[PDB]
From Swiss-Prot, chain A:
<dbReference type="InterPro" id="IPR000915">
    <property type="entry name" value="60S_ribosomal_eL6"/>
</dbReference>
<comment type="subunit">
    <text>Component of the large ribosomal subunit (LSU). Mature yeast ribosomes consist of a small (40S) and a large (60S) subunit. The 40S small subunit contains 1 molecule of ribosomal RNA (18S rRNA) and 33 different proteins (encoded by 57 genes). The large 60S subunit contains 3 rRNA molecules (25S, 5.8S and 5S rRNA) and 46 different proteins (encoded by 81 genes).</text>
</comment>
<dbReference type="GO" id="GO:0000027">
    <property type="term" value="P:ribosomal large subunit assembly"/>
</dbReference>
<dbReference type="InterPro" id="IPR008991">
    <property type="entry name" value="Translation_prot_SH3-like_sf"/>
</dbReference>
<keyword id="KW-0963">Cytoplasm</keyword>
UniProtKB/Swiss-Prot annotation, chain B:
<feature type="modified residue" description="Phosphoserine">
    <location>
        <position position="23"/>
    </location>
</feature>
<protein>
    <recommendedName>
        <fullName>Large ribosomal subunit protein eL20A</fullName>
    </recommendedName>
</protein>
<feature type="cross-link" description="Glycyl lysine isopeptide (Lys-Gly) (interchain with G-Cter in ubiquitin)">
    <location>
        <position position="140"/>
    </location>
</feature>
<dbReference type="GO" id="GO:0005829">
    <property type="term" value="C:cytosol"/>
</dbReference>
<feature type="cross-link" description="Glycyl lysine isopeptide (Lys-Gly) (interchain with G-Cter in ubiquitin)">
    <location>
        <position position="116"/>
    </location>
</feature>
UniProtKB/Swiss-Prot annotation, chain C:
<dbReference type="Pfam" id="PF00572">
    <property type="entry name" value="Ribosomal_L13"/>
</dbReference>
<dbReference type="InterPro" id="IPR036899">
    <property type="entry name" value="Ribosomal_uL13_sf"/>
</dbReference>
<dbReference type="GO" id="GO:0003735">
    <property type="term" value="F:structural constituent of ribosome"/>
</dbReference>
<keyword id="KW-1017">Isopeptide bond</keyword>
<dbReference type="GO" id="GO:0022625">
    <property type="term" value="C:cytosolic large ribosomal subunit"/>
</dbReference>
From Swiss-Prot, chain D:
<comment type="subunit">
    <text>Component of the large ribosomal subunit (LSU). Mature yeast ribosomes consist of a small (40S) and a large (60S) subunit. The 40S small subunit contains 1 molecule of ribosomal RNA (18S rRNA) and 33 different proteins (encoded by 57 genes). The large 60S subunit contains 3 rRNA molecules (25S, 5.8S and 5S rRNA) and 46 different proteins (encoded by 81 genes). uL4 is associated with the polypeptide exit tunnel. uL4 interacts with its chaperone ACL4 and the nuclear import receptor KAP104.</text>
</comment>
<comment type="similarity">
    <text>Belongs to the universal ribosomal protein uL4 family.</text>
</comment>
<protein>
    <recommendedName>
        <fullName>Large ribosomal subunit protein uL4A</fullName>
    </recommendedName>
</protein>
<comment type="function">
    <text>Component of the ribosome, a large ribonucleoprotein complex responsible for the synthesis of proteins in the cell. The small ribosomal subunit (SSU) binds messenger RNAs (mRNAs) and translates the encoded message by selecting cognate aminoacyl-transfer RNA (tRNA) molecules. The large subunit (LSU) contains the ribosomal catalytic site termed the peptidyl transferase center (PTC), which catalyzes the formation of peptide bonds, thereby polymerizing the amino acids delivered by tRNAs into a polypeptide chain.</text>
</comment>
Length: 140, 163, 194, 33, 118, 106
RNA sequence: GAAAUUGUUGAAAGGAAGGGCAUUUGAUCAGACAUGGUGUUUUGUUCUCGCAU
RNA sequence: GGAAUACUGCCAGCUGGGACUGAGGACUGCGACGUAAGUCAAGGAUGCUGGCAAAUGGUUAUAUGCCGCCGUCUUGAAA
RNA sequence: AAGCUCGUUCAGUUUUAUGUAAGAAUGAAGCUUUUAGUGGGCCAUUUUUGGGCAGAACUGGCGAUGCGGGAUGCCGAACGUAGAGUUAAGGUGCCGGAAUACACGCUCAAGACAAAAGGUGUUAG
RNA sequence: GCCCUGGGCGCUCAAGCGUGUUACCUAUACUCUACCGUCAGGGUUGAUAUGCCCUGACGAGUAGGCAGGCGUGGAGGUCAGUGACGAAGCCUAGACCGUAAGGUCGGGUCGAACGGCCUCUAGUGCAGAUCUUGGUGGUAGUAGCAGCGAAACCACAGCCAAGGCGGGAAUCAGC
RNA sequence: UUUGCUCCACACAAUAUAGAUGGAUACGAAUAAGGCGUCCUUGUGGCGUCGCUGAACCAUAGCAGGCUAGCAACGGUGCACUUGGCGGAAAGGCCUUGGGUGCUUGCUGGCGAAUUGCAAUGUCAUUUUGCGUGGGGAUAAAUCAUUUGUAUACGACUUAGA
């Protein structure tokens, strides 16, 4: 095999994705649910939180291309997401750490969510389309 | 969208000059060469186009009752015709005349000769009623049976044509 | 889009209406036509009548041409020539079409629709002659026009009372909204577009 | 083995015409009179 | 591995023109509107359908099929086991088939048509 | 919420074709609401899914789905060309289709 | 012990079909024959020198 | 007196959305980055991830979108 | 096809000489010798013949010719098997894949050989 | 200028006419790339060869010419080839390979000899020939002699609107 | 035909969709005018005003939508009943009185969501048919035969009979 000259350039994320932004998932068991972006992982996935205590969505890895960006942002500076890593999702039934870490993460974000009025209930409600909707026109 | 150009020639002198209306300088040069044969006996290889320059309207913000003398080659010879057109610029006035000729007499750019265009600054000078009617004092008239482009295939209100 | 669309033939043009209905049918949309007896065709009565009478005698010989009298069937024939009939796709498309004189039930209690680009008044130049189709059908052999009008007259009645009741209900709703105005919720909705 | 297209792929564009670097570094394409 | 997508170009095997209508006509391709390659007619085999050299004669498993009928023939593939697979002829008795299969397995040569008469 | 829809609905018209020649490798898909190619530009690259039911139970379920993609716009009415790994059957002319919102960029 | 031709059973559909381009449905099948590839200790003519592993 | 703007042409200007293509096969060649090691979009794709014991797909029947009896003959290609 | 030997010699290519010494342009060879087949008319054109018609000196095209368009029999374009994008002819109300697109007027019955003549039919110099 | 006397549906501020301005539909045409082949140029052996390669162009076609291949009968040499533990032949809606003449494999019958390779050899490849020999269908349980059982004919067609010379079960009564 | 036939309740399968994935979300009449609210000296009337698109209206928050606590009203609404009216064009639907029973996101809280591992429509509609029980309802008709003679080429047609 010849020496292919293709360097692993780091991923470039679209400007519409910023930490603390409200994300919407279009695929998966949580499709249609509203989630909060936290950190970008080395595997090109997005670390997000429901938070779990609000809508039941735990910390999960998601792909940007399947996520619709929104202008609504919330503070995420107080959450120490450095603990999470790609190795934190390997498996080779819920693990004990998955509960305590999720609770700790949600404790530092439930207050911020409650700071903005109607944001808790807004996240608790699953997003869905309606008759006559025109996503291209809508800003989301 | 026509354009006005001034083209001169002298067969390599008298420096024959005329005004040519064309969509581009290339067509203007061809029309000038064609008109040279009609005006006098000259050929393309005889000389060269001394200068060609586009002429822009001095002020395309004023309504002018342009008087135009146009000669066209009908199916049975060529006849001299004169008309008056109300417009804002010579470029639009000549285009309107061309469209009117093509609609009625079916004369087109191939067989239409533009002689002279001049504005009319005094009332009662225009002898054509279709232009004379617009030279009166500030008037008002409606636009009955107006229509709207309904993008949607279906309508539920039974649209009305009122204005 | 509604599962089924009802089109009011009143003040419409046979040609454009048939073309648009056929195009929608080919796309897989169910459409129904009502008040077909009031449809209109461009040109004076004599021209349209002659164009139809000549058709009745053009021969294939009864296997081909049929002296079909119903105006709804005439409209269907007009739309028939705009569809790829005699094939599975075209025949299936025609299955989603129904034409009835007047407005029989249960279509009466449902919102009818009109095609803005197929309106006879909108597209036909004012002052020019036009044909009402009903007279043509009556002259060519149709005899149900009198009964159609008689039982359509009852359609306007009762429906008028229903409209009056709906008008009273909307009056009450408008009064409730007017007295509801100036509320905090209303002010917030107005500020946020709604 | 593969025909690199100039204009695009600026790396190959620099292979030919070394003056392209100076042209891009001096905005000569929009030089004022 | 060196088993890239093998494009057959034309999977449908050609059939003799009008062979379906008449029984006497065999399906073996034979030249004669077909000669004029009119629209809506069967295509004529031509040089355009040539398979790539690097993948010609290769089975979907990415190995050449080599007929074998003796121990020496199977052993000859010992050097070319990576590319050539063994294939037992239909005339080989079941008695020698066991020995051939055992030798192929011991030398790593794959058998295209195992279980024959077993 | 009563409505769980997350894909833009549409219709299937016919494959790319001429007066007498039709190529099923390209399918013309109409998207509800779209009117001009400019609006359809947003739907480019979106996966198109067709859902149909069969009596036999396939390996995973009773539902079978085809996974396609959008290629480019078509016409002045906003029609968009759709390509599938397996071309849709001709019987589905005029049938509805599902256009998902991913992959997205907004 | 082959074809035209005909008899039992199973799939089929509505003044006609076999033919060509791409797909689904029903049936059916090669189905990857992966047998592979990585480094040690246990016992006998101290031991992985090599055999069951 | 002054700019602006429509139009034309240039950018070896920038920034995206979408479609097909991965073809070559250990390094030798022309170039950019760098004070040097070395790096690069620089004579053809790499890195990661998920579903799988029928997987993908093949022949065939039937229905859908479009297309459509043979050799010799006069020889004007023709019935 | 068959030997030589010159790599240059050639052209259905284009103006001044008066048809050319062309150190004018553009493109890129010769003698042989024997070896299968080859004896048609025609569409359009040319020379432009006379009184309907009949031969005719000529220049482009088939015969051996697919494909898109014209419902079907001149225009485009001349052909390996495939993926991707733009077009020719011809089209964008449906059959039929494409805008019931914009702008200037026309027309009441048409519209996709009769023009010799009339209309108190309609609109312009 | 247009009208009157002189492809189907339909169209009438056209979906008719002339013209101007943008967009779109798609041929085997054009542009980029994957593959086969021919034609042209070149590298090649102090061994890497009628070979292993690199680069470009080209791909219509009757008669005709040249080149390259499969297959059947027989013969010379070889596979110290296959085969009663089943070879030849036959069927396969099972698969593989060669784009091609075809080859291979698994399965149902089979019961006595055959296959590849380098060559030689010819009574060597069928859809036609109102072809030959043999067999078999509709006609048809029809005329026929409740009987007994054919012949003629048979590519396949037919319900008509017109031009490129072509808009439905079954039997009984008229020509 | 071991409820055989039929309409229902629950109950397991096959069968497929010309193709749901919130709502066909009801006047008439004119298009060189019509509504809407009001006035009334009631009319083809006066006054304010609406169009120029549905780019809207009704709804839409909960494990695809659960449990439970508190506040304000007895409004909204899913569903089993009941008094009554309207709809005969293809009426087969529209409702209306009264309570009963869930929810109510109108407002404020406590509970579980994870593992489908970064997605594989991630299965929720009925069209028809088949088999298993219980809640009722009724228990007939036609052909041949026999014959008729208005009919009658032969069919056919028209009859009488437990």
């Amino acid at each position: 095999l010849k020496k292919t000259r293709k360097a692993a350039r780091p991923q470039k994320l679209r400007a519409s994705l910023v930490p603390g932004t409200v994300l919407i998932l279009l695929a998966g068991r949580f499709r249609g649910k509203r989630v909060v972006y936290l950190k970008h992982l080395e595997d090109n996935t997005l670390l997000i939180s429901g938070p779990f205590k609000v809508n039941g969505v735990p910390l999960r890895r998601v792909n940007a291309r399947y996520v619709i960006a929104t202008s609504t942002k919330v503070s995420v500076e107080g959450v120490n997401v450095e603990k999470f890593n790609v190795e934190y999702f390997a498996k080779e039934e819920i693990k004990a750490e998955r509960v305590e870490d999720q609770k700790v993460v949600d404790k530092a974000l439930i207050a911020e969510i409650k700071k903005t009025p109607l944001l808790k209930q807004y996240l608790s409600a699953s997003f869905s389309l309606k008759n006559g909707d025109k996503p291209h026109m809508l800003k989301f | 969208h026509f354009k006005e150009y001034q083209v001169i020639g002298r067969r390599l002198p008298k420096l024959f000059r005329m005004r040519i209306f064309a969509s581009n300088e290339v067509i203007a040069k061809s029309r000038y060469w064609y008109f040279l044969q009609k005006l006098h006996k000259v050929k393309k290889a005889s000389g060269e186009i001394v200068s060609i320059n586009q002429i822009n309207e001095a002020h395309p913000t004023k309504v002018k009752n342009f008087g135009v003398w146009v000669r066209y080659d009908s199916r049975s010879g060529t006849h001299n015709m004169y008309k008056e057109i109300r417009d804002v610029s010579r470029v639009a006035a000549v285009e309107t005349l061309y469209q009117d000729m093509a609609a009625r007499h079916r004369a087109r750019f191939r067989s239409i000769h533009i002689l002279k265009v001049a504005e009319i600054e005094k009332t009662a000078d225009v002898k054509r009623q279709y232009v004379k009617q617009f030279l009166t004092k500030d008037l008002k008239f409606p636009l009955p049976h107006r229509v709207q482009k309904s993008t949607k295939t279906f309508s539920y209100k039974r649209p009305s044509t009122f204005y | 889009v509604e599962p089924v669309v009802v089109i009011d033939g009143k003040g419409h043009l046979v040609g454009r209406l048939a073309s648009v209905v056929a195009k929608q049918l080919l796309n897989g949309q169910k459409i129904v036509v009502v008040r077909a007896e009031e449809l209109n065709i461009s040109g004076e009565f004599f021209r349209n009548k002659l164009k139809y009478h000549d058709f009745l005698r053009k021969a294939t010989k009864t296997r081909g041409p049929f002296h079909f009298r119903a105006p709804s069937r005439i409209f269907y024939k007009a739309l028939r020539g705009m569809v790829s009939h005699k094939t599975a796709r075209g025949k299936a498309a025609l299955e989603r079409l129904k034409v009835f004189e007047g407005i029989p039930p249960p279509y009466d209690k449902k919102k009818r629709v009109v095609v803005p680009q197929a309106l006879r008044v909108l597209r036909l130049k004012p002052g020019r002659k036009y044909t009402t189709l009903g007279k043509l059908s009556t002259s060519v052999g149709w005899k149900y026009e009198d009964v159609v009008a008689k039982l359509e007259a009852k359609r306007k009645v009762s429906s008028a009372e229903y409209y009056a009741k709906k008008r009273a209900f909307t009056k009450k709703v408008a009064s409730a909204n007017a007295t509801a105005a100036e509320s905090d919720v209303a002010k917030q909705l107005a500020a946020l577009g709604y | 083995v593969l025909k690199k297209n100039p204009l695009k792929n600026k790396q190959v564009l620099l292979r030919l015409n070394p003056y392209a670097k100076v042209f891009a570094a001096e905005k000569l394409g929009s030089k004022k009179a | 591995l060196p088993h890239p997508k093998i494009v057959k170009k034309h999977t449908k095997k050609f059939k003799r023109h009008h062979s379906d209508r008449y029984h006497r006509v065999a399906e073996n391709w034979r030249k004669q509107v077909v000669r004029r390659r009119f629209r809506g007619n069967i295509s004529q085999p031509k040089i355009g359908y040539g398979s790539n050299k690097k993948t010609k004669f290769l089975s979907p498993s990415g190995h050449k099929t080599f007929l074998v009928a003796n121990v020496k023939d199977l052993e000859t593939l010992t050097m070319h086991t990576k590319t050539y697979a063994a294939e037992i002829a239909h005339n080989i008795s079941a008695k020698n088939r066991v020995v051939i299969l055992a030798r192929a397995k011991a030398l790593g040569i794959k058998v295209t048509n195992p279980k024959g008469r077993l | 919420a009563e409505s769980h829809r997350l894909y833009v609905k549409g219709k299937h018209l016919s494959y790319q074709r001429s007066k007498r020649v039709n190529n099923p490798n390209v399918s013309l898909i109409k998207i509800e609401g779209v009117a001009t190619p400019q609006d359809a530009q947003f739907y480019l690259g979106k996966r198109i899914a067709y859902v149909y039911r069969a009596s036999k139970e396939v390996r995973g379920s009773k539902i079978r789905v085809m996974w396609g993609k959008v290629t480019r716009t078509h016409g002045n009415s906003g029609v968009v060309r759709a390509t599938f790994r397996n071309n849709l059957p001709a019987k589905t002319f005029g049938a509805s289709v599902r256009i998902f919102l991913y992959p997205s960029n907004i």
